[model samples]
Target chain A: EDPPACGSIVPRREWRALASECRERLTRPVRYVVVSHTAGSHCDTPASCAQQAQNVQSYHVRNLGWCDVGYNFLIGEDGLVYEGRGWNIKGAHAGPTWNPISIGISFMGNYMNRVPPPRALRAAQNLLACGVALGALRSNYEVKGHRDVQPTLSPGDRLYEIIQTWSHYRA
Target chain B: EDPPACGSIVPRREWRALASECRERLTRPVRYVVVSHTAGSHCDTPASCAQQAQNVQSYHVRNLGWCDVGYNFLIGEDGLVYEGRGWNIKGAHAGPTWNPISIGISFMGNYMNRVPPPRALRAAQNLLACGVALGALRSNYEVKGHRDVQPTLSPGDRLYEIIQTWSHYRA
Candidate 1:
């Protein structure tokens, strides 16, 4: 069988994302996963969510001048995972210290005042299991809200509160 | 010789502030200072800053049901520092762990995308030196933006950036 995939992740091509110029890669079997939120608009349908994914990449690459979209992965309300840098490449989502050692997965919307639908949360959780299956994350990986590791309201308040109940959440 | 005072700080009486029911006191020669922002309306006159100070105390005491205003002092754009719990009293500005161990001073407005005037900055800087002279702070006391010690955007990004260049700031 082909190597395990991180769910039905929508590749950059499917989302019409620009090619990334980033060269940094994450060491496999990362011990930590940092969850964040874009603090932007929510996208429900596959079409809208894909566009948001493109917008995030565009903002990070063009406005912020980063190598690529900051998150390793982005979860959409459409219950799809949109690939950004993916599991092997390092992401700019978390700060520099955490970026090198952890996978950063951002939900493509503001979560401070609202929670992502249950389907989206499930999609994110499923990706975690498969990330381990593909040997991209440690079997005993730690989960942290972006706010937990940085001075931000990222992952937002409502979402940050939700992740604490996850089995692997640390702090 | 008279004991050193913390510059021309407006006392609680002069500002017409509420009496604090809180009785906890800090150990003198405190080793840390936490800078923060009210994140509310800004004031450029002595009268308005005093009113803004009262509004903060009311919100904390009436809405949040705190014992008093949160900060030990509040800096105004009018180039004055308004007294709160003062150096000897513990402040609730930097969370539970820091309240007992540090002096907290908040600038009275948002500084996320703005910097306080030079006079306001000087008022804070002058307060620091006087804290040491008054035996309220250690000569080697470390300065920190509120966000540096907690998961908040407290002292704000621009203000936080400014403190890092100061002689006593750590991280």
Candidate 2:
């Protein structure tokens, strides 16, 4: 689902303008950036997509009420990235034990039933690389799905496989 | 590897002969039976199958060395089921935490690579039903893959999906 703030497609270059507002406020460099990807098992409509983000957000709030935004950023199928919990405010996306030191990022839509659109995936990847290029963050970082450490198969198997293939994350 | 007294090609009926011996020796009525299926990489050669079994057996002994056999029964691609840990003794197949109260069962090849030969899967399904009928076990037994509870992905994703589709496992 596209966030209310999503305007005309923001070119990658101009994208930094939006994040700067969040980035400049951070004193510590973002070392671990987690990318969240959804595995679709339900409706694919725009309203449905928006509702999913809302639902997942609520899930995080209830489970991790301590952290405002479950992740640092959230990307939807519509190619819009929503700002999440502020920087320096550890994320709650990583498992209970690992959350304090990591940044969480979630992608909207279930990619389990079908491969995510290349555009959405490509956008996320480039954004990830951009995240790395920033002098504050490290060049090599770990990006994993929630299910990687947890027992439940949340982000469908097929989509997780694609992510593994692209991320080159080995078992 | 085949048991010392058991060869790879024993007819399915012969399994009863062996069972008869153990059946009389066992004192308990095997109240809980745990059925497990594995799905991973595969090999068609008999040598590879033997090696695979050896690897699995040794791994169990070294990491979960408490029991004589990890599984009460093991179904193979050859459409033959080999007796694993006997009914009376404890098993080491599932982790130590789950082994004492559970009877582990395994299928030789990874079902995720391709469906196990139809006959092989049928044989396993039937054998499982028999376990329930004999009062040696209950019908509400839990069936799952080795990977479900553990962090490692020993069974392939596709095969685990098959197990979930046919059995009563929750994860």
Candidate 3:
């Protein structure tokens, strides 16, 4: 299918070059995305391990990997949304099928150990609100964990429960 | 492909009794659901859509509608996770691609007009957390909007952004 090019790994500093496109795409939004904890422990290999917001930033830029925190945004355990891929861009988070159509956000811990801290969950929900405010967004963004696809149970049971129990946003 | 047992339009009251084996097959853990807004001014129908969540207890007794809301869970603007189509049991939400393997969730808002409310978004995220707690769950309980797989943009734009933005909860 059509892969996401807008939110793919681009230079974090070059986000301004894509702002107009981001705004244009945000006007006609199509999909949503949900992520769990980002703690390092959640992964077996260091490369695949989860990283907090700051760590992710460093790894992306300093590590000279891809976009500094390539995700569209970052949800902190403190209940905050950190900008990542910006807007009007395709995300690298979801695989090919769902990537181009959705915005990708992630938490800062490895939820497998337990449910995400209330702060993080709240932040994620709050960020979701922002994503919705954009007129060009999708209608039904189902809350989910990574394990929903592929074969690695990363989000974990306790955390995924929170997602299922609270799939809809209120008020 | 394995065609799901039971007819498509079973009576609401007789759903449980008529499809005991179907219910039994839902024994596996429900990962993620494809939900939509059921109320407000949505782009699709605008009257009473199918994106919201219903009450679980009422659903358990098969009192909601459409033979138990036609989803595994339903979330209302009040931010409640109502059970639909027995938890462990699978049902047809995204046509054949997700039947039996997915526990569908629906939101009760007209997202076609606007994105899901904050309350609904928060509840949806928490609901995913609950799904994770269930051991049978995967790392990232893949949450998807039907349009991701098909072509029709039933869910709309705003809400889909939230899902795309948060797809980072990887395994």
Candidate 4:
């Protein structure tokens, strides 16, 4: 089956994404959504947010030696969604078990103590709706914070609290 | 007077730069800093910018069949500086004349009509300052837009205007 598609996503060309050399692919209708935060710098402008998207990919590929950006989609504070590996690829986000089965979406800032701006949150929710529509995600997909499955303090405490209130979030 | 040391700069090791096969070296106390833009992709976060740097190198090495990333250094919108061929090695930015005498620092973006964020500009200036202090650049070193020496309209029109006003800028 074809992969699910999210609407209004920043194309790799728009964000100037490097060609991903990743070879793994995830099965369609991914059942889980792993949400995390970059925990780095934040950008509020589309231009700057685009740069942030490039920065994230650089670390994953250049430093960590990853095949591509770890997340499937990146939510920016500029209220836009940036594509990473997108829906079809298996991302190296959560861990062995989660990476193969879930779609990893990371917010482009540290959300440890601060909540993501409303626009950023809305973008994430909107992306999920698009994912469902594209059949990239199961209609009843579960959303979980990065910390839930991994030992690292990802997605941050404050942001994690907010995602818990999401209707699709599971314990 | 020497310029002040800028904030953190990502070293070659941090970004996992390939061992350079570059051998041509520049004379010390360099007299010029050439500014340009990749006219390609830009990055805002540390991670993404690093990827951008790697992508540039991959193109130069794999596609263009060059020794390494062509520029001496690269600046990211993330407010960080990146090491490319670095201070001593001759860069491939401009033509033979300027490449050997000037330090080529390219911003990672297409800036035809757009302007980089204030922080990105600040980082570039700070990097120049650091260069002066390290004796890699002359305290009296002049800043020139890429178009000043090259036949192309690089560094963008909008960016070209901004650099023209800097203290060290020369026609």
Predicted structure with the largest lDDT when compared to the true one:
1
TM-score of each candidate structure, all chains considered together: 0.57, 0.40, 0.38, 0.51
**Models ranked on DockQ:** 1, 2, 3, 4
**Cα RMSD for candidates in order:** 10.0, 11.8, 17.3, 17.7
lDDT of each: 0.87, 0.51, 0.49, 0.83
Task: For candidate 2, write residues B1-171 as lDDT tens digits.
Answer: 433332334332443322222221333444444445543334444445545555555444443332333456666676666666655556544444355666666776555446667666676677666666555556776665665533223345555666777765645
DockQ of each: 0.05, 0.03, 0.02, 0.01
Would candidate 2 be rated incorrect, acceptable, medium or high by CAPRI criteria?
Answer: incorrect
**Which segments of candidate 4 are over 4 A away from where they belong?**
A1-171, B1-6
Encode model 1's per-residue lDDT on A40-114: one tens digit a residue. Answer: 788999999999999888877775556888789999999999999998899886665688999999998889779
In model 1, pairs of residues that clash are: A37-A155
lDDT of 1 by residue, B66-98 (tens): 789878999999999999999999987766568
> What is the two-chain DockQ of model 3?
0.02
Ranking by lDDT: 1, 4, 2, 3
**Candidate 2 local lDDT, residue B68:** 36
- In CAPRI terms, model 3 is classed as incorrect
Which residue pairs in candidate 4 have backbone atoms (N, alpha carbon, C) closer than 3 angstroms, thus clashing?
Answer: A51-B43, A51-B44, A52-B44, A54-B48, A55-B47, A55-B48, A55-B49, A56-B48, A58-B51, A59-B47
Candidate 1, position A121, lDDT: 99
What clash pairs does model 2 have? A36-A105, A39-A110, A40-A110, A40-A111, B39-B155, B39-B156, B69-B85, B112-B159
DockQ, cand. 4: 0.01
Number of the top DockQ candidate:
1
